Design a binder for this molecule. Structure first.
Ligand SMILES: [Mn+2]
Ligand SMILES: [Mn+2]
Lengths: 296, 16
């Protein structure tokens, strides 16, 4: 005992759609614990390297901007009308990390074969301790719930391949990534290490000025140039890298002659940027199109 | 033999 009243939880999460943005949904602690526990089971039963098929919609960082998450579903179609892949960074920086991750977990549980969540670098206790999620849990619930989230985040998948052609991850490529089997061998639960394959997948960035690999300004992981992308795509017979992790003005931005695209789905990020958010739709023929969300 | 292609039809969503 007991079951999880998923439909009531989702109904309450969706209730505030159209209300003055910022209006909270305060689930019970056990409801949220239920969401973490049941989704954690689902994450572990599915591969850490997801293998997905189009059509699906792909979204980048949300960062607790819950009403922008709802807008994405509004324009993209609420599950299960459309399949979704999110590229991580659900929490921190925004005002409503809790509503955000809870709706995502809820949909993961309700539609486990049509709804998918990758791990971002903010789905990591050492990071979201600092940038808001801990403070939000502590304020609205307790630190024990925050540790329950950590335990759940530690089981998220870290990459996805869509129809053997699009490689998806939060950050980018790794100098340790030589085979896809190296990703599949990563055991869960796990924290995000300070270095290595898992770290790079959640932390690395493309860089125009770097030929091969370079030092990353974040002080973690690496930057990789257009050449690194071309070699990677050719080696694994892929057409595109789809990642997130960086705020871009129009919500999406191409790199290396459209061989890589960055998606960022949190419009006016932190209230400091004037960026749009974007969502990429991939149809059954792997035609990719962008919906852009201008900030409210 | 499917290949990734990009639509030039971009949809923008505003709030009036
Ligand atoms: Mn982010
Ligand atoms: Mn990130």
């Amino acid at each position: 005992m007991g079951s999880l009243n998923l439909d009531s939880i989702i109904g309450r999460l969706l209730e505030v759609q159209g209300s003055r943005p910022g209006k909270n949904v305060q689930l019970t602690e056990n409801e949220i614990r239920g969401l973490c526990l049941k989704s954690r089971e689902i994450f572990l039963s599915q591969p850490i390297l997801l293998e997905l098929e189009a059509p699906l919609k792909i979204c980048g960082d949300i960062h607790g901007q819950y009403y922008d998450l709802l807008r994405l579903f509004e324009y993209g179609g609420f599950p299960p009308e459309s399949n979704y892949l999110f590229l991580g960074d659900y929490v921190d920086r925004g005002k409503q990390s809790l509503e955000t991750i809870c709706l995502l977990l809820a949909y993961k549980i309700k539609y486990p074969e049509n709804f998918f969540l990758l791990r971002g670098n903010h789905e990591c206790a050492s990071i979201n301790r600092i940038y808001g999620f801990y403070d939000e849990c502590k304020r609205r619930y307790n630190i024990k719930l925050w540790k329950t989230f950590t335990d759940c985040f530690n089981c998220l998948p870290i990459a996805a391949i869509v129809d053997e052609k699009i490689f998806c991850c939060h950050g980018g490529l790794s100098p340790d990534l030589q085979s896809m089997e190296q990703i599949r061998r990563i055991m869960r639960p796990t924290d995000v290490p300070d270095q290595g394959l898992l770290c790079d997948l959640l932390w690395s960035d493309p860089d125009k000025d770097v030929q091969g690999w370079g030092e990353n300004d974040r002080g973690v992981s690496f930057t990789f140039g257009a050449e690194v992308v071309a070699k990677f795509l050719h080696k694994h017979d892929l057409d595109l890298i789809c990642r997130a992790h960086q705020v871009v003005e129009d919500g999406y931005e191409f790199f290396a002659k459209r061989q890589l695209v960055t998606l960022f789905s949190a419009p006016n990020y932190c209230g400091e940027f004037d960026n749009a958010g974007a969502m990429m739709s991939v149809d059954e023929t792997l035609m990719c199109s962008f919906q852009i969300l201008k900030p409210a | 033999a499917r290949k990734v292609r990009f639509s030039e039809k971009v949809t923008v969503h505003f709030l009036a």
